């Protein structure tokens, strides 16, 4: 059983750096290349490049070369994607996928969210009381979204139980 | 400039054959484009189906097959199942880079009542049941990170 397991969702500010991990198992790591793929929300997939896991040499797509870089920790069967100087448009789900030719086995995806730099530049002038009100008003919205996921989950679970028990 | 084009959406019925196609802006798709087909299901769960035009990835059901038909790459699902409802992407190799198509949303009619599950084996139902909780936890953790991102500039303003 071949599995690629990526690090969990990550949040960073514009201008910061993120590292996405991809741990491979079930095959000899250095015998197949590792691709990296970007999927910005609601948009299609873009190939970032590959890394040859035997030679350690990367090959980049022209639009990603520069701020996107690949490295390895071969002894651990890990491939890394490094994104530096993060920009708003980098918010996306990133995937590793093993060769090949192309994209045979896929990691689960890592959602990288780049926070709003512009918001700090108007909020910096607010009082702590108005900032705290803003901060706390996000919590009911988050709690409502989570409660909705839990309900949809229950609605997917029940027909499976019904089928097991039929 | 190089564009890979797929049908945006199509619908079949369970048990029928359906074909999805993948067109290149450079002309005919050939074996030199090493056409791939991959499937996306919630929550951003990608499976590889076909690589190198017609090579089915181990463990994919044999009802999935890849070919070239006229000047396009094609994925044929011979006997589509209700759980094949998903988004299918093709990718083509153009000398020095991969380009993905925009994806085809395949609808398979009839599963809203979940009656199809009553025909499955116990082992396959148990596997589907056990996969649900981790998928739901992943979705919740992504909500939590969406809100950590929204909180970040506020916290920075508090901490300035």
């Amino acid at each position: 059983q071949i599995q690629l397991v990526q690090s969990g969702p990550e949040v960073q500010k514009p201008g910061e750096t993120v590292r996405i991990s991809c741990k491979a198992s079930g095959y000899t790591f250095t015998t197949a290349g590792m691709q990296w793929v970007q999927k910005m929300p609601g948009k299609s997939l873009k190939w970032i490049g590959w890394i040859n896991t035997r030679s350690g040499v990367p090959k980049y797509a022209e639009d990603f070369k520069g701020r996107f870089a690949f490295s390895l920790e071969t002894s651990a069967s890990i491939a890394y994607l490094h994104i530096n100087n993060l920009k708003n448009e980098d918010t996306a789900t990133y995937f590793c996928a093993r060769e090949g030719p192309g994209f045979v086995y896929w990691g689960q995806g890592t959602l990288v969210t780049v926070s709003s730099g512009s918001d700090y530049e108007f909020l910096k002038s607010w009082t702590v009381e108005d900032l705290q009100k803003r901060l706390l008003a996000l919590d009911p919205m988050m709690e409502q979204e989570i409660e909705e996921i839990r309900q949809k989950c229950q609605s997917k679970r029940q027909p499976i139980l019904d089928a097991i028990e039929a | 400039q190089t564009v890979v084009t797929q049908e945006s959406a199509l619908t079949t019925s369970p048990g029928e054959t359906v074909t999805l196609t993948c067109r290149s802006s450079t002309g005919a798709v050939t074996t030199s484009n090493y056409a791939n087909w991959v499937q996306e299901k919630p929550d951003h769960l990608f499976t590889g189906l076909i690589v190198g035009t017609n090579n089915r990835v181990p463990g994919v059901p044999p009802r999935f097959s890849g070919s070239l038909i006229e000047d396009k790459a094609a994925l044929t699902i011979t006997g589509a199942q209700t759980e094949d409802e998903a988004i299918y992407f093709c990718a083509l190799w153009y000398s020095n880079h991969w380009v993905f198509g925009g994806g085809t949303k395949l609808t398979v009619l009839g599963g809203s009542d979940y009656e199809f599950l009553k025909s499955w084996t116990v082992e396959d139902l148990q596997k589907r049941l056990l996969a649900l909780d981790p998928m739901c936890e992943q979705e919740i953790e992504e909500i939590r990170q969406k809100y950590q991102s929204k909180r970040q500039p506020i916290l920075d303003a508090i901490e300035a």
């Binding site: 197949a32 290349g33 590959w50 040859n52 896991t53 035997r54 030679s55 090959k59 060769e99 090949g100 030719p101 192309g102 | 090493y34 190198g52 190799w93 020095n96």
Partner: peptide, 6 residues
């Protein structure tokens, strides 16, 4: 052929 590592 395909130049990736397969």
């Amino acid at each position: 052929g395909y130049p990736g590592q397969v």
